[PDB]
Amino acid sequence: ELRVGLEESELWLRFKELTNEMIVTKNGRRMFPVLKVNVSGLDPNAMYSFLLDFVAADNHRWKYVNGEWVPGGKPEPQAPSCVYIHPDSPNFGAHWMKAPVSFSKVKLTNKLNGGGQIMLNSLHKYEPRIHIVRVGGPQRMITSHCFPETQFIAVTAYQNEEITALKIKYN
Numbered sequence: 001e002l003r004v005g006l007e008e009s010e011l012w013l014r015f016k017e018l019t020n021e022m023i024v025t026k027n028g029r030r031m032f033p034v035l036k037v038n039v040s041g042l043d044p045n046a047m048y049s050f051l052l053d054f055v056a057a058d059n060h061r062w063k064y065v066n067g068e069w070v071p072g073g074k075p076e077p078q079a080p081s082c083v084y085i086h087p088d089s090p091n092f093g094a095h096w097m098k099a100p101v102s103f104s105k106v107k108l109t110n111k112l113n114g115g116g117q118i119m120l121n122s123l124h125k126y127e128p129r130i131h132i133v134r135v136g137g138p139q140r141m142i143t144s145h146c147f148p149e150t151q152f153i154a155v156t157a158y159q160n161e162e163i164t165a166l167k168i169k170y171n
């Protein structure tokens, strides 16, 4: 059985219990913590690409009001995010299973951008999601996995200083 697990869930849960925030910039900002995924049960000899996207967890705009995140009252449908191709793709199962798959080079932006960078809407709440695509083979296959522990609100600057402090303490 294909098993997908979160590396350093310990640390992600500290961020999550405070409400996690990720900076987005016009040029694109890398994530901290970095999404690292433990993968077992692939065919060592089969070929796979790892894809990352961000699901809008709800349809609302969020605001930091008197030290607390609170949703707007006017939902709008959230067009799905673009997909980030893990730069080590495509690769043998063996490659993906020999160390945690680390999305250290994805950059989060607030502006439609040349390439690489993934555009998010600021003050929306996002749930990271990967797709493992079996490629080259006759029988194309996709397995998807969500990481609730890694939810965050996209922000142009940090609102909750407890987050600012965790980010610095653990970077």
Ligand SMILES: COCC(=O)Nc1cccc(NC(C)=O)c1
Pocket: 049, 083, 085, 089, 090, 133, 135
């Ligand atoms: C929007 O389409 C999503 C996508 O990028 N698919 C996709 C699937 C499998 C492999 C690759 N490309 C590499 C470089 O491995 C791309």
